[PDB]
Design a binder for this molecule. Structure first.
Ligand SMILES: O=P(O)(O)O[C@@H]1[C@@H](OP(=O)(O)O)[C@H](OP(=O)(O)OP(=O)(O)O)[C@@H](OP(=O)(O)O)[C@H](OP(=O)(O)OP(=O)(O)O)[C@@H]1OP(=O)(O)O
Ligand SMILES: Nc1ncnc2c1ncn2[C@@H]1O[C@H](COP(=O)(O)OP(=O)(O)O)[C@@H](O)[C@H]1O
Ligand SMILES: [Mg+2]
Ligand SMILES: [Mg+2]
Ligand SMILES: [Mg+2]
Ligand SMILES: [Mg+2]
Ligand SMILES: [Mg+2]
Length: 325
């Protein structure tokens, strides 16, 4: 029989153009059949009625019932491409940073400010004009303030008085804008945050996209805080610039992929001061608008499936050479 690869995610992701481009390519494998789980089934049917698969590609995004996906995996015991339990941790920036540190991955110096919502003023925070002290640790402006929830994209950057003060407020892109300047110089007074040193880059973020530990595509984009005006092409896509990862960065990608147990994994690098710092690990993310990435991503995933499952299906399989980017 065919090896079944099940795709289990919210429709917003499962029906995205990149997903469709990759799935049609995975379907080219002679012995693989792709089955995309309907969102209505994911949300409203018990896991016992979800379709069978032999390999499960499943990932959390807003509204996804991760507890059900875990229960399904436990019930059916499929080969899992992106580990589900790690996806609980990926939702919490504190957990993400803790894993990065445990793996010896360079990241910004940071401190966690946990605030009791019932008692917001008695947290370990002291604030001056050009700095904060978080659990006694000092951050001179510029510094970055991130909500502990990784799914909250309201990241603020606080500028020193010498540069005019105020702050840049980042958010999920709204049409042409990715951030806005605020005259507010004082930090947020409710919520829990990570405070971290600002890493000076050349004005770009490096976005990395792994497909297993030995492949990563990288590309760059204008730092969303620089002025908040998104660079768009004639198709309405964000302008992306060429990047080739150096040897250190290829190792970082290997480590992130394995540490988070996410075969398909996006994360962000800040190239600063002659090193590269991870500032965000998002888990499952596909590149938009690279034909070559669709080809490579589909072939690697299909080959991962065959390698793991061909023997139990009695299908002959010889491990082919794969590119690294
Ligand atoms: O909101 P989510 O998290 O469910 O989905 C978002 C996520 O896509 P994913 O699921 O990972 O593929 C972002 O990638 P990411 O994971 O690297 O995120 P972070 O580094 O944590 O910010 C992506 O930003 P980008 O990397 O393309 O700039 C963003 O596109 P959008 O702002 O629309 O960009 P445009 O199409 O307008 O240019 C998506 O927003 P929506 O689709 O509106 O919800
Ligand atoms: N320590 C830092 N130094 C400089 N820029 C940062 C730092 N942390 C985040 N940023 C900038 O803010 C953006 C959003 O932060 P990120 O941690 O990626 O949050 P999100 O999960 O919302 O994407 C980054 O892409 C980067 O441009
Ligand atoms: Mg097929
Ligand atoms: Mg996500
Ligand atoms: Mg959007
Ligand atoms: Mg990011
Ligand atoms: Mg993120």
């Amino acid at each position: 029989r065919q090896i079944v690869v099940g795709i289990c995610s919210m429709a917003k992701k499962s029906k995205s153009k990149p997903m469709k481009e990759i799935l049609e390519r995975i379907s080219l494998f002679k012995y693989i059949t792709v089955v995309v789980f309907e969102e209505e089934v994911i949300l409203n049917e018990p896991v016992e009625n979800w379709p069978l698969c032999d390999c499960l590609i499943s990932f959390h995004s807003k509204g996804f019932p991760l507890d059900k996906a875990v229960a399904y995996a436990k019930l059916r015991n499929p080969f899992v491409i992106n580990d589900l339990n790690m996806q609980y941790l990926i939702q919490d920036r504190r957990e993400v940073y803790s894993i990065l540190q445990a793996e010896g991955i360079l990241l910004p110096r940071y401190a966690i400010l946990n605030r009791d919502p019932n008692n917001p003023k008695e947290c370990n925070l002291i604030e001056g004009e050009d700095h904060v002290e978080v659990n006694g640790e000092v951050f001179q402006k510029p510094f970055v303030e991130k909500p502990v929830s990784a799914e909250d994209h309201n990241v603020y950057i606080y500028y020193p008085t010498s540069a005019g003060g105020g702050s840049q407020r980042l958010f999920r892109k709204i049409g042409s804008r990715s951030s806005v300047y605020s005259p507010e110089s004082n930090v947020r007074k409710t919520g829990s945050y990570i405070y971290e040193e600002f890493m000076p880059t050349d004005g770009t973020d490096v976005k990395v996209y792994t497909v297993g530990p030995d492949y990563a595509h990288a590309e760059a984009r204008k730092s969303p805080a620089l002025d908040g005006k998104v660079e768009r092409d004639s198709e309405g896509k964000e302008v992306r610039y060429p990047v080739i990862l150096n040897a250190r960065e290829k190792l970082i990608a290997w480590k992130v992929c394995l540490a988070f147990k996410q075969t398909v994994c996006g994360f962000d690098l800040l190239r600063a001061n002659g090193q590269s710092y991870v500032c965000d690990v998002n888990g499952f993310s596909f590149v938009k608008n690279s034909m070559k990435y669709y080809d490579d991503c589909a072939k690697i995933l299909g080959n991962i499936v065959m390698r793991e499952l061909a023997p139990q299906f009695h299908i002959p399989w010889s491990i082919p050479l794969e590119a690294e980017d």
